[PDB]
Symmetry: D3
Subunit: 238 residues, 6 copies
């Protein structure tokens, strides 16, 4: 066991879906997997393993923000043999053409965190997803007739930002959604030589102020989950 995960090697599948909300992981396990079993619950950070169409798949919360998800992702990779991480998150939109409930896929993630500069000799690391995982997710979406935008996320350090003018800069630069984790997840994946992807559902609009309820974020973002799960199967086939 680790300080953060009360599980043993083998308890996780080699692919893990990760929302920041452990109650969304519970929702995913109970409603999309067969034979689901809870495998960890330290700090209430619930993780589960079950099967989807014959395929062993895990789902586990990562908490909010880069330093939180970095602990969980690093442990899964280095202690539990995990090969692929798919973050299944929420995000706030800054572009007028991107609506609440749209699904976006972060091929890259910008950030105002220092973590990748710490890794990368204070130069610019382009925090990117694994291409084949991006392609598999886009393809899974198309097959279900779900529209997705593939582009840059922005992984924010401060949800309550003292610099809101930066949202306009994000919009100008084509950022598809604001969250707080992907750039960190992609940094860990590169560091440890694993593969990662972040898929998010727009849960609020930073410009219009439109919101979803805590309950909707927890229980109703089903399209991203279907896309994520199908993309796992597509990945196995190639």
């Amino acid at each position: 066991a680790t300080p953060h995960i009360n599980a043993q090697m083998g308890d996780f599948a080699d692919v893990v879906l990760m929302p920041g909300d452990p109650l969304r992981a519970k929702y995913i396990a109970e409603n999309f997997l067969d034979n689901a079993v809870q495998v960890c619950d330290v700090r209430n950070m619930f993780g589960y393993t079950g099967t989807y169409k014959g395929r062993k798949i895990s789902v586990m919360g990562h908490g909010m923000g880069i330093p939180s998800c970095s602990i969980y992702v690093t442990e899964l990779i280095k202690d539990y043999g995990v090969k692929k991480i798919i973050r299944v998150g929420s995000c706030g939109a800054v572009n007028e053409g991107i609506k609440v409930r749209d699904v976006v896929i972060g091929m890259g993630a910008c950030t105002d965190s220092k973590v990748n500069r710490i890794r990368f000799k204070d130069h610019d690391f382009a925090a990117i997803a694994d291409y084949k995982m991006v392609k598999a997710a886009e393809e899974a979406a198309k097959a279900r007739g779900i529209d997705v935008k593939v582009g840059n996320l922005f992984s924010a350090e401060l949800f309550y930002t003292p610099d809101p003018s930066m949202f306009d800069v994000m919009d100008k630069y084509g950022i598809v959604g604001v969250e707080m984790e992907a750039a960190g997840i992609y940094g860990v994946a590169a560091e440890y030589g694993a593969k990662a992807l972040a898929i998010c559902t727009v849960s609020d609009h930073i410009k219009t102020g439109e919101q979803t309820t805590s309950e909707e974020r927890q229980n109703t973002f089903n399209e991203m989950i279907e896309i994520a799960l199908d993309s796992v199967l597509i990945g196995d086939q190639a």
Copy 2:
């Protein structure tokens, strides 16, 4: 409600103890407070309000790392009228003379986060506790005969750091414990005009490799909790 707390204004006391672990907050509420009631549970981040020797006090988890605790601390101050935050955390020691289960108090907190540079025009903001809160914590510890070191914490971004040589730099500079939150909490406190303090129990020795179990971290760090709660009463005194 806010996106992260399903409570109403008035539901929290004006002072809140905050461990990173919502199960530690549950433990504190159930074992140290009278009249305890759970006031929130979004994302499993449990928060409670009760009384300690008659004084209304809340306790709530803040999650791990600066971006997480910044969310919760900001909301408590700006949305729930909270005046004082006492982080009751764990930490790793870098100094050979600081032992697992030692209690330390962060008058200041160093960090490798960018959050305070973002706030402070890319200059060095010294992330500090409120002085009277520090003094009250130290004097609560003295009364109970619990030894404490008061000094600099280091709030790390990366628990699994790619730069372990930094630990010896921290030690050379007198850092008393490594955690992942205080510098962010002190930044929010200054930005929003409130007061904060971080008190931590050493749960790991970073030099030797010693690590307490998950369960120990959750339910057995009683000294810091006693100090924290007594410090609230001390700090309430007229003219303290």
Copy 3:
């Protein structure tokens, strides 16, 4: 006319292939395009427009390094209506699994340049290609039976670097090739609302020392050219 391009609006197609070397552009126009006409030659930076399998396409050199290519790409987009840029470059390999003449596609581009920090309030801009352009290139490669790797490039400021230890960091982080341009091109595309992709042919192995000749770089990297041109046709398909 601009200071760097003596051409008229309309003289370029809405897609432009850009090698660093204006003589590689000449090679491409003369050997891969039909009815090519030279449209510019300021500073010996040759550009041409012709057709490929009926589709109007331009090819123009961008010189070496981020500041050079930034000028040409910016002008093409803002002054010449160009919508899509495909850099067709060379690069150095840092991974021993990657060989001279391998073709790599930069879905992202790391850099030690300050240009994106200048644009992006000193934060980390993830300099990325347009996804549909990456997909079209990878599919064009497959249709030709050409192996490719899709990953991070590193756009270097100093070819003669004072810090060769950085190559090992690049390799550890999975950089598929070192060049000097993509991160700048991707920054311009995003700043000006256009689309870009960099495909490169490995021309040097930085670990082993293998180095192709100038003539080889100029006239013999055909596979990347084939992939770029084919990818334009794929990218044109309605609904792609």
Copy 4:
């Protein structure tokens, strides 16, 4: 013996009061210590040793600015065996409720200098005073009925700042005074394993433009001296 101090080991007490102004050091020695003797004068930077209530105490100027004071503080600690440094300085107020002649105590010191980034791998070092020294000064002030604010100083590089908008930022973040030294002194004390504290008298109001005369700064800031001296005796107590 050192390039900046023409004294011998033993000439300084283990506690040194340090104003920036060597003439304020002379004022202090002549008016607050008994039997003070001058022990150094290189570069006109006067230092003295005498007794206060029989207790050996030194006072010596440190010049203006982080690089100047760092030289002197470093030498005192590493070459003259000094254990505690109490800066007795002036400062400019940025908060309207803070007045000329108010005494402030720097539990922390923010800065726009690069010196601590140089020491601390380019991370944020929270430049803090020694806690017991803060507490002793605070308590000495209360015993004399002198109000003091305990909080963050801001140690500035440029007295004539090109960025006066930063003063508004300091005020919003609760900075109690602007001086030019504490963050550097605190950085030295941590690097060399000693203890330090900065106590300052407000000599300038940065918002209103009020400025005391050079005469006043040199010979009339008596309260901070009384507090500093009393705090030495308080801090000497075995179990303090």
Copy 5:
């Protein structure tokens, strides 16, 4: 041969004039040198060697921007035995009193590039010319009755800058011209132990918007060439 220069040792003189434009190099070689022969042409980057009043002199393009010119200048110095580089460039004026066709000499060059930080442990390297080269050029100009301003250039990374407000900062600080190369050439010269100088003719006024044609930049900036060539002879003198 190198990947950028198809010449051998001995093909270049020990002093090389370098415009960014290889066609300006051709112009110089054809009209100001005797018996100029073309010694390289890779990537269309023309270089020539002839004589001026019997003295062996080379002229070669360096392309646009710091990363491009760094390649060529580094190769000339380390692979071709070159001792002195004289950039003969264009530049944009930011001062009202500096006019198109004025000749300026960069004793130093500011920059927004990261290259010298990369070289100089992230500190500030003052990118400066060789003093005697500055003196020879200034004296050559005076002997010709040509007025020159000697001061700081600014070597820009982005010609199409997203921060035009920086031009006013340059003007306030006395920058005599903005180009894109000098700070990088000066860093290479210092890194490799050679000597360099940048002399530039104002081709654009950034404040007034006035411009010259590409043809003018290429074929008509004669005063800087005459000054540069005269300065080589002056600088050759024993005891200069």
Copy 6:
């Protein structure tokens, strides 16, 4: 009067020589100027005005380090009408061919200070001397048969540096002397539109350990004083 200078407009000449050490300023005034009178003495920072060969000249200490000298030089320029500042300092050598007592001239000054980044939007300001002042000083030296090196100083923040490996980088980049002021003085001069120069006598060798005494630094660096004063008269010449 200012808080740092107890003099009135007119008390200073329009050129001021400035050592860091106010006792060296006294020495210069008493032994090199005619009819010198002391014009200021706040914080023991002695300043004087007299004549050299009939020319009105001032000499005043600036203290140690960039923040200290920035105060005095800024006041001299903006409050006392000063046009030219000649720092007459000491420095440490890092190159094995530069010896104690050699005289060097800082045409540029590198620095690890943040001051010019603060001024210059976080870019690289090349902190340079005024060209005619450098030329006049070099030519004054030659006329006295005094050999001088003209190049980059390094203005250090931390005399007791925690990074002595930086000295090798300085040597590799051709730094002629290490002091603690020039880069600051040059930035002030540029900010306020005045002119400055730093001439320094090597007072110790950072590589070999060789030193000079406090008394030698104060009273025996005559060559640099003679050069500085002579350079004033040369610089006054019409048309120089």
